[PDB]
Amino acid sequence: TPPNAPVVTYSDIVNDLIIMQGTAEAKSQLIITDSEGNTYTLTVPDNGKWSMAIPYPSEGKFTITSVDAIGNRSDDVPLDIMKEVPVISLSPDSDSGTVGDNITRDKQPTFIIGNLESDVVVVQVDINGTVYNAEKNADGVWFFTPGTPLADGSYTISVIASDAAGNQKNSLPITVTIDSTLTVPEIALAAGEDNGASDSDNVTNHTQPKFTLQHIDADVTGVTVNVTHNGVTDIYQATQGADGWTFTPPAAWNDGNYTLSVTVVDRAGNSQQSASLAVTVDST
Amino acid sequence: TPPNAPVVTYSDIVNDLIIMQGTAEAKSQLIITDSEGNTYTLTVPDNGKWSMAIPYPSEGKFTITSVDAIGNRSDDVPLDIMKEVPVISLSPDSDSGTVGDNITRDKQPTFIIGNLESDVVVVQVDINGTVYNAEKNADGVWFFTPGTPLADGSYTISVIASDAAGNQKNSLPITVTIDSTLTVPEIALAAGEDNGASDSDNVTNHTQPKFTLQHIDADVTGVTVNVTHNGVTDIYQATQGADGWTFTPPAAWNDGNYTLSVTVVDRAGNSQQSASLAVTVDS
Amino acid sequence: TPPNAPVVTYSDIVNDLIIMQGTAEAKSQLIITDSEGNTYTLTVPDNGKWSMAIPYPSEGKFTITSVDAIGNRSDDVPLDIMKEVPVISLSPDSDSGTVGDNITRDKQPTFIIGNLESDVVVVQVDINGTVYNAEKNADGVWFFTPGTPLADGSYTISVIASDAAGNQKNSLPITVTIDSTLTVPEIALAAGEDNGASDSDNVTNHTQPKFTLQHIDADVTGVTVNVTHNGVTDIYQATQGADGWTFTPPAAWNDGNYTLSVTVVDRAGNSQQSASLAVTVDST
Amino acid sequence: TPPNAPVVTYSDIVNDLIIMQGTAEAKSQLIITDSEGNTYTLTVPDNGKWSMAIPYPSEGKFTITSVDAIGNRSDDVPLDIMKEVPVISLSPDSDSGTVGDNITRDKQPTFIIGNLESDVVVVQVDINGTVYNAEKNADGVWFFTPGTPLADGSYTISVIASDAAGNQKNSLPITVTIDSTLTVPEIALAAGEDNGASDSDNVTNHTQPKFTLQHIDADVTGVTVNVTHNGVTDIYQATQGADGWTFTPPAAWNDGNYTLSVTVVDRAGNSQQSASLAVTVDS
Numbered sequence A, C: 001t002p003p004n005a006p007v008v009t010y011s012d013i014v015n016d017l018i019i020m021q022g023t024a025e026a027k028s029q030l031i032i033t034d035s036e037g038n039t040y041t042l043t044v045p046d047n048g049k050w051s052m053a054i055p056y057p058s059e060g061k062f063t064i065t066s067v068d069a070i071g072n073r074s075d076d077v078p079l080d081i082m083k084e085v086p087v088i089s090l091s092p093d094s095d096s097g098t099v100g101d102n103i104t105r106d107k108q109p110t111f112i113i114g115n116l117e118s119d120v121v122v123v124q125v126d127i128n129g130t131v132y133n134a135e136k137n138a139d140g141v142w143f144f145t146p147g148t149p150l151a152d153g154s155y156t157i158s159v160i161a162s163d164a165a166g167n168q169k170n171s172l173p174i175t176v177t178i179d180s181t182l183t184v185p186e187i188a189l190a191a192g193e194d195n196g197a198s199d200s201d202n203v204t205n206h207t208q209p210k211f212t213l214q215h216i217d218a219d220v221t222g223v224t225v226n227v228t229h230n231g232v233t234d235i236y237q238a239t240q241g242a243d244g245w246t247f248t249p250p251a252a253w254n255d256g257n258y259t260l261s262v263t264v265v266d267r268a269g270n271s272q273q274s275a276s277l278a279v280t281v282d283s284t
Numbered sequence B, D: 001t002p003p004n005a006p007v008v009t010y011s012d013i014v015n016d017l018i019i020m021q022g023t024a025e026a027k028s029q030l031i032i033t034d035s036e037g038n039t040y041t042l043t044v045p046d047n048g049k050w051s052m053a054i055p056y057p058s059e060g061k062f063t064i065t066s067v068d069a070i071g072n073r074s075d076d077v078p079l080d081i082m083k084e085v086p087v088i089s090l091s092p093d094s095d096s097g098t099v100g101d102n103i104t105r106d107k108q109p110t111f112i113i114g115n116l117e118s119d120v121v122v123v124q125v126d127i128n129g130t131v132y133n134a135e136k137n138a139d140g141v142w143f144f145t146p147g148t149p150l151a152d153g154s155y156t157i158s159v160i161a162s163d164a165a166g167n168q169k170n171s172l173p174i175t176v177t178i179d180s181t182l183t184v185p186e187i188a189l190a191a192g193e194d195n196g197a198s199d200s201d202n203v204t205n206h207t208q209p210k211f212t213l214q215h216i217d218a219d220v221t222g223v224t225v226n227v228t229h230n231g232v233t234d235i236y237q238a239t240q241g242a243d244g245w246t247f248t249p250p251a252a253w254n255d256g257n258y259t260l261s262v263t264v265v266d267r268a269g270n271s272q273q274s275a276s277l278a279v280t281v282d283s
């Protein structure tokens, strides 16, 4: 009768080597053949306990067989393991505003999945518990883009990859913020400034009137004020002070008509301009 | 604005410790809280890379959050990993014949499952490509016993475990052989032993007639001959020789009537007894 | 000609297994024999690169040989490695006061050294850079006790162990504090209290006089006041307040003579009693 | 009282990270400062056990200190470890003959030393039990070349490195064979070939006389015969047969005078030429 199948009782992967221990018929030949045509053979020690280390072969595939001194073969023991942990990332083309920060205004961002072994057949993406199938593109790259817009907020996202044997590895999570929201800001003459004949006609006797900038979101990275006088527009950086965001022209204006607006941009590259405000300076 | 969520870029488990590296807002507090209510806090270095090691918590469960110098808190990063590789084995109580060779005559053997974490939600046993769900006994031990007898043959078996979070680990396989089959053997007088008048009457004039033992399966581990004389049965060990299995009485037989059968036992502990053979010694 | 010696080009120890890779004559038999009589043999693959894992044998000792298909042996390659990191600790018998804290008043504390493999032949102890030979006692335990008293202070201590092959491992450090110092404390009548006919005769008209406890070191764990009146002594726990350490008897004393002292104990179990103070209460 | 010194109870290096566990005053700040000026701070958990991972710093150098909520600082715990295992190898420039077999005719071979950390203060080469100190060339590469020729034989060699702190690592050994020896070979006319009148005159009547090649060391890898005729030398490859090494001219020789010698080269690249043999063909 041929020897009984060898038994693998321990395995570990340490630095691209598979380390194994098991049992097999004392004195027989243990034959390990990998997916790459490599063969490693050893003599099972007298107590029938063996140990071995082999380089990790393509797709984690190898088979172990016992052969006795007279050429009889055991049942083979096919093994198919997996070692690579998959990675998921926000595509740079779906990463708006500042690049690299995992914040974007793309409500249907594309995710790219990497570090997959060549026998991976199933790739799924978990978005806050909802699981979706990933797609493989023309270049053989796995990716996922939501079919409907994601609402604004912060999403915990990971990828799960399995091979044909059903080995499954789960990525580290990433945290992606969808931010497609920015309040339209507003510019107005500050409290004392709309004076003279009225508190609401936007006609002021101040040649250097002070403006309040309101509805400026906390995640704003840039605040500018646009001033158009006689068909010519100049842009100024807003002041952020103890009083909030304000604008005062850096020199006195001639009497005349000024159209102002304020523009805000946030981290995701959202951009809004205020309704315009038509002011008249009248100091004489 | 609160700080952005911290990022874990690397993890590994080395002797009961989870080792992590990541990024986070420079100078912020990174707070790690595990399922056991432990809290590990660290200050993120100026270059924004952090590293840490924590004891593996119950169920692989912990969350990481960033808090700034003003007490504003980031979105949390929940982790739920699994480290234990499950083990499956043939129950000693289902391992017939030679012990510990994964060969049994039990057609519904019990497999014992071990090394599972408390948050496991799927325990599956793959038998030659078909998965069945494992069961838990009243003591809390996971096992699988097939509901219907297995056919004789070779069975590659593994167990797969998954937690609630979806992490999955696959055992090393075992190879179990079901062997409930054993050919009924045959005892006869060997060539030249059924002598005297007729070659077919089973009357011999030899006082130590040689018998041939036939139809002995290759996995037989024990061969005995049962000799009944004067109503009483004696058991003898057969001898395997250059001509195969035979039996010659160890001392001379008296004239009279004998009844013989051979019994074989295979490595799985199956046993078969031949038809009986009535011989007369007439010397 | 016999095969050339096999070459080991990689080794690592992972969980009681020695993992090895190297080169040797293609198709030859590689024979690994350990210190415990164990033999592990394998066939060198066709490219002449081999890998193996063996249980760590006694004293990290094994030899590797090549044998060709016709029985000729190479030069052997003897290996002798070491895996255990030595440990040093303060002996519990040299650990005064609170046990377990590495603080002691023993200026010649004994250190115990452990986790040494059986082939270790040299054991040295490094105390803030000064290196000393350890000794082995009757039970075969390595230890070190300083020959002269160590001055008070904090010492960074480690152990270095080597085997016969000259492999050397260095322990983690320990930090041991020698504290054999405690100021003798003093008890005195507080500012207003030595009154009546004099500010320095220790005769007071206060029936519940207040005492100051001075020269109490910061590392004191216990402060008590001893009061002897008519040959009978009672002990009280001192008060630590906004004013420091003080004592006031919890009820009025009869007129008469009181002898007081204060006793301090520190973490190392150092213990000092003040000079006694003879006070007289006279309220009539 | 400042807090007591923190304690490191466990360390290990796993892919460029130092992994540590220890104890320290509960709720205190543990500050780790490395040789590169990085600082990693953590809050010690309520149960007083801390764990951490840091990138391996230049020279394995870092210190750990405890600071309490009031800014009092413990005694520091300086660590200085070493992770790199040194490597030694035979310089290709000193590896004669067959390349990469650690066998050479160079009696003062150069060994190249690699994988040393910047704080190394001892670099030693052990040759069959005697240590010599290694040298550093002007480019900064450590090496050892013996000052006096090595005798022929087998040399087990390893390198040992130590830092200023006293940490020591030992390389895997190499086995180098010095072989500068090769027996001078011999060419003669084989049995029956020195024929005709005298068996000793080296006049043959064979136009393709067979020659025996003798005193060929077992480690010979190349055997050639130099045939000089009419003042010009031709080189032939000898043939190793069932009778050993021989040479028969590949085509018939004209009557006249020939001069022969055999040249052997061994695996180490040593070469020897035999004495010349003058033969006359007279057919």
Ligand SMILES: [Ca+2]
Binding pocket: A059, A060, A061, A080, A081, A082, A119, A163, A164, A165, A167
């Ligand atoms: Ca695979």
Ligand SMILES: [Ca+2]
Binding pocket: A095, A096, A097, A098, A099, A100, A101, A102, A103, A104, A267, A268
């Ligand atoms: Ca972005």
Ligand SMILES: [Ca+2]
Binding pocket: A179, A180, A181, A182, A217, A219, A266, A267, A268, A270
């Ligand atoms: Ca926004």
Ligand SMILES: [Ca+2]
Binding pocket: A194, A195, A196, A197, A198, A199, A200, A201, A202, A203, A204
């Ligand atoms: Ca107005």
Ligand SMILES: [Ca+2]
Binding pocket: B059, B060, B061, B080, B081, B082, B119, B163, B165, B167
């Ligand atoms: Ca889990």
Ligand SMILES: [Ca+2]
Binding pocket: B095, B096, B097, B098, B099, B100, B101, B102, B103, B104, B267, B268
């Ligand atoms: Ca069995």
Ligand SMILES: [Ca+2]
Binding pocket: B127, B128, B129, B130
């Ligand atoms: Ca099937």
Ligand SMILES: [Ca+2]
Binding pocket: B179, B180, B181, B182, B217, B219, B266, B268, B270
């Ligand atoms: Ca059977």
Ligand SMILES: [Ca+2]
Binding pocket: B194, B195, B196, B197, B198, B199, B200, B201, B202, B203, B204
């Ligand atoms: Ca008959």
Ligand SMILES: [Ca+2]
Binding pocket: C059, C060, C061, C080, C081, C082, C119, C163, C164, C165, C167
């Ligand atoms: Ca050793």
Ligand SMILES: [Ca+2]
Binding pocket: C095, C096, C097, C098, C099, C100, C101, C102, C103, C104, C267, C268
């Ligand atoms: Ca103590």
Ligand SMILES: [Ca+2]
Binding pocket: C179, C180, C181, C182, C217, C219, C266, C267, C268, C270
């Ligand atoms: Ca003290």
Ligand SMILES: [Ca+2]
Binding pocket: C194, C195, C196, C197, C198, C199, C200, C201, C202, C203, C204
């Ligand atoms: Ca007085």
Ligand SMILES: [Ca+2]
Binding pocket: D059, D060, D061, D080, D081, D082, D119, D163, D165, D167
């Ligand atoms: Ca160092």
Ligand SMILES: [Ca+2]
Binding pocket: D095, D096, D097, D098, D099, D100, D101, D102, D103, D104, D267, D268
């Ligand atoms: Ca060479």
Ligand SMILES: [Ca+2]
Binding pocket: D127, D128, D129, D130
């Ligand atoms: Ca020597």
